[PDB]
Structure 1
Amino acid sequence: TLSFITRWRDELPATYTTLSPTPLNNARLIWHNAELANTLGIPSSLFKAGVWGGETLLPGMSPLAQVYSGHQFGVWAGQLGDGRGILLGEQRLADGTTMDWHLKGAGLTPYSRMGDGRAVLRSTIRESLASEAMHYLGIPTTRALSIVTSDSPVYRETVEPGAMLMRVAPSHLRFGHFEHFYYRREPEKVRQLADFAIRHYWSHLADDEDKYRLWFTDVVARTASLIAQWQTVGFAHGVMNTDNMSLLGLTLDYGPFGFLDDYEPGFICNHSDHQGRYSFDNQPAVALWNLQRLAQTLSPFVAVDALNEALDSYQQVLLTHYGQRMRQKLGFMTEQKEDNALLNELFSLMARERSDYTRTFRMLSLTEQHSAADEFIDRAAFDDWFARYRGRLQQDEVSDSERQQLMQSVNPALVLRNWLAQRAIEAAEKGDMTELHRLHEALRNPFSDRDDDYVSRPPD
């Protein structure tokens, strides 16, 4: 009843190795995304480890591990690849889409290098939670379909349970795919990848008419738009290597990510990021550097000037998405020239007071235009800003009522803070999945107001 195709396998030879998953010991399904499975047409009976732990294949699957390369922390790292995941197959849906089924943690691969080919329970739970949270925030992302755990030992800093995440995504094409064949001096493979991407994901681009220029221009636009969205909700990726940049502009590879709590422009959650290369505030600059590295691979067949003209549009596109989203976050229904100084004043104020990001904007969503109605060390400086802020809201013509309603639709009540995920991971390891299911449910309504500790500070 499910339709899989062998598109990547048939059309992109020599980009992969065919292999099957390596099952874990006593693997069992612990969580599956019931909403997504209905969207995908998956029979519910399939969840009663099977395919979710790589122990069986569904008809039409032809599993393979893709090769790719990357710049890691700004330095060429050579060949990477699907070192601990398997593309099981590509599913065609009724709307004409294809969805990759990628099993993360499926075992050793020719691209595992010196790693064990496994994932652990805590990292797969964090990835599932964050990817689902990002989707309900309206931010392009890979999706999480299932998690299996096992009694198989996997060693990181402690001994942990081996686990697998079934990831689904429209594509796993990364900037690092193009780099891989460019620095192998195989410029025709690079063009083949670009042609494959345009044929399946940009099919309105009529063949040859400025094909690659308009395509790359749009690739720049989607990555600028993704970063703008991260910035407004306080998402720090942590590992923006070129092999983790989705060509389509989806959030990809959830490792040492972090949703901002205290507002900290130079916030770093990657423990190995010594220089803060992937600090929250460098994400705009880093994404542009990643696009420049992609632009280098395309120069064999795209005029180097049209490449730089696409790269020059990055800042305006990022600024437009960012500015429009923040103005909704600030309740600015029109556009006054007081708006930039007002925001810059708030952020510099928020950074000196270490205000909680999500809470600051959610509380600001209760603002009444004519009312001046204590989380700051310098209340005098807030009332001064809050007054000049409120005077600008008066110009907006619009009511108190549904200015607050617009703000509550763009300022989340709940985000996935590190301590919420950790609580679900702890209970999960003890064999209690209630907190993991509870947290998943809450994250499907990030803009609803809450009674419980899902909107609170980390206890500390």
Structure 2
Amino acid sequence: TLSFITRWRDELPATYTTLSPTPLNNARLIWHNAELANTLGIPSSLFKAGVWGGETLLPGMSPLAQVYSGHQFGVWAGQLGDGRGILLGEQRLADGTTMDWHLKGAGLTPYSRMGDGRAVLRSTIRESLASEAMHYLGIPTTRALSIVTSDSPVYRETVEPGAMLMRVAPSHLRFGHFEHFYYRREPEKVRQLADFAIRHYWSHLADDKYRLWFTDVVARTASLIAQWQTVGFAHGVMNTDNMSLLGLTLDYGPFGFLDDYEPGFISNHSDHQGRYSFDNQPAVALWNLQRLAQTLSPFVAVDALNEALDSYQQVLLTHYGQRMRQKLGFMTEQKEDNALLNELFSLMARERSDYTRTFRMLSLTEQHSAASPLRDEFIDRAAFDDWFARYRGRLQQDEVSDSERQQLMQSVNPALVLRNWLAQRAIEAAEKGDMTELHRLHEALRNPFSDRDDDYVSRPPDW
């Protein structure tokens, strides 16, 4: 009954290779996203490995692997592509929008570059948990519809079970798609991609279209990174092929949500220069946008490209600043705000304070009371009490009740984030065949702004 179309295949010829997934050995479905399946209109019967393991095609699907290129760790890498993933099809929804179904781990393709074409259970689980977590934090992201595991050995640092993730997203367009055809000296294919993107995702733009479009591409990336900074998400691999044109979080690998507040956090152990450290994300995404701008210069006026690039800073800082004010419960903008936040961040960094728990406990603040669960979390309690006294004194300038402010703060400061230790515990149980933890953790991550009475709100063990 579902409606699939071959929009990419037919409108962007010679940008992909058509092929089928390669099923794994004894593949089994271990989790699917019931809520997302409902919003997509997927009959519950389709989950009873089937399409989720690349073993069945639905009417209208026409699987293909896309080509693209990227700058990796700041240097041009040339062609990369869908080396282990396949766009099974584009699902048309009743409101006219369209959603990609991309099977990650689907098998060898022309872009596999001597790799095995496979994904592993631990990484499919992590990507499913982080992407769904990001969605319910309200941050744009690819979504996770299903995981299958299998009996197929896949060789990494150790042998792993081969697994597939069904990833859903409005598009998998990457900055690297544009770079691919620019460096392959195919400027009309770069322009075809741009016009495809505008037709399907910026359709309201009448035919100044490129200036307005690229200004909005910049805005959406600036907004994305501002959101990552506010929640403490470190991506770890901001290569240009992992930058979504639409401003979605894309390609969860060696990511991390902060536990202790560490501005220079390096989540990716292969990032030996810290290029993708947490505090570098805003500079890196501007550099990525600058590389994307270069590809558009054959048909977008340079003044327009630079007007868009110039706006990145203010879009990012306005989003970040307004969001941090919400997190602090600053219900009017005041001059001392920036200094109070710098003081708090300095306190947290020097105390190695937990990021999420600090803001969640701060949401319990009673402006006329010096008591707080935060006091016990600081070794230097006097320094904390001093900041907290000045913070509450400033809160009083808003003239807002504790009830109203706590409601706001609890609506924007999550009680829980997808910490590495939580994902790892889910992985260990799934690997032994027990999916209860994976399901329970997914359920909790759908409700990040509610308090909990279990250990999903707990810091990782010190040892």
Using the size of structure 2 for normalisation, the TM-score is 0.98
**C-alpha displacement at 1:457, in angstroms?**
1.0
Please list the CA deviations of residues 229-276 of structure 1 after superposition, one character each: whole Å capped at 9, or x if unmatched: 000000000000000000000000000010001000110110100000
Q: CA deviation at 1:172?
A: 0.1
Offset from partner CA, 1:299-326 (integer Å, 9 cap, x none): 1111112111110100100011101111
Instruction: Work out the number of aligned pairs and report it.
Output: 458
Q: For 1:293 and 1:7, how far apart are their aligned partners in 2?
A: 27
1:277-299 per-position Cα deviation (integer Å, ceiling 9, x unaligned):
00000000000000000000001
Structure 1 residue 448: Cα displacement: 0.7
List aligned pairs for 1:14-25, cutoff 5 A: 14-25=14-25
1:245 alignment partner in structure 2: 243
Per the alignment, residue 203 of structure 1 pairs with: 203
1:109-166 deviations in whole A, cap 9, x for unaligned? 0000010000000000000000000000000000000000000000100111000000
Which SS does the other structure have where 1:113 is aligned? coil
For 1:267, what is the secondary structure of its paired residue?
coil
Rounded to whole Å, the distance in 1 between the matches of 2:197 and 2:159 is 40
Give 1:185 shift.
Answer: 1.1
Matching residue of 2:442? 440
Deviations 1:377-432 (A, max 9, x none): 22121111111111110011110112011100000001100000000000000000
**Rounded Cα–Cα distance in structure 2 between residues aligned with 1:12 and 1:283:** 31
Partner of residue 267, structure 2: 269
**Which residue number corresponds to residue 81 of structure 1?**
81
CA-to-aligned-CA distance 1:15-51 (integer Å, 9 cap, x gap): 0000000000000101000110010011110111111
Secondary structure of 2:167's aligned partner: strand
Equivalent runs, 1:144-223 vs 2, <5 Å: 144-207=144-207, 211-223=209-221
| CA positional deviation for 1:438 | 0.5
Separation in 2 of the partners of 1:383 and 1:96? 55
1:349 Cα deviation (Å)? 1.6
Alignment partner, residue 138 of structure 2: 138
- Structure 1 gaps of 5+ residues are none
> 2: distance between equivalents of 1:379 and 1:95?
55
TM-score between the two structures when normalised by the length of structure 1? 0.99
Q: What whole-Å deviation, never above 9, does each CA across 1:187-218 have from its counterpart, x for those lacking one?
A: 1110000000000000010016xx10000000
How far apart are the structure 2 equivalents of 1:331 and 1:95? 37
RMSD of aligned Cα (Å): 0.7
Aligned to 1:353: 351
For residues 96 and 231 of structure 2, what CA distance do their matches in structure 1 show? 31
Aligned equivalent of 1:107: 107
Question: In structure 2, how many angstroms separate the alpha carbons of the residues matched to 1:227 and 1:438?
Answer: 29
- Aligned to 1:395, the other structure's residue is in SS state helix
SS in 2 for 1:261: coil
Q: 1:51-98: per-residue Cα shift (whole Å, max 9, x none)?
A: 100011001000000000000000100100000000000001112110
Aligned partners of 1:334, 1:269: CA distance in 2, in Å? Answer: 35
